[PDB]
Task: structure prediction
Amino acid sequence: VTKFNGLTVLPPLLTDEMIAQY
Amino acid sequence: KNIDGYFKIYSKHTPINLVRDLPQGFSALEPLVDLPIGINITRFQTLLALHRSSSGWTAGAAAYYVGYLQPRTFLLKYNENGTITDAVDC
Amino acid sequence: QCVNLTTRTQLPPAYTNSFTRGVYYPDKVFRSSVLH
Amino acid sequence: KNKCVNFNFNGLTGTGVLTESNKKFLPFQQFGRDIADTTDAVRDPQTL
Result:
């Protein structure tokens, strides 16, 4: 596959492990 | 170069082994000092050495190149150490 | 002072071709594996 | 370092907290910026 200036990156609800469980 | 009375001096030293032609490589010129002279520079000269064992003097063996800069757009590629490794003329 | 060197010979200013010379640091900003 | 306090550097003025690093600056450079054009690395003027 291919920081504190007011740009907040939120984590998703489902992580990378929960994608593989589905 | 002179930027509003602040004179900038860039320098680069590398060993070579040639006669006439410049190498087909790349080098980054780092700044050495900063001289706030506050004056305008339009002409220049170059110091040369002479010897005699002011008209019967004899010079040694050296050469230099004089170029002209142009305000064009250039790219700067930096490595992990923070040095310029490549340059792209647009 | 005003005496010129009489052992000089006037030669035509021939030119050469440079490859990638003439690149310096425009500022004092540190970078790391980026391109500007 | 290790405290969010106000700083006034040569190329950055504001509040920040300094941490340890392993970078190597050039002897003519005084501060460094990231890809986002934000100053995040400076140099001590007395200690190397």
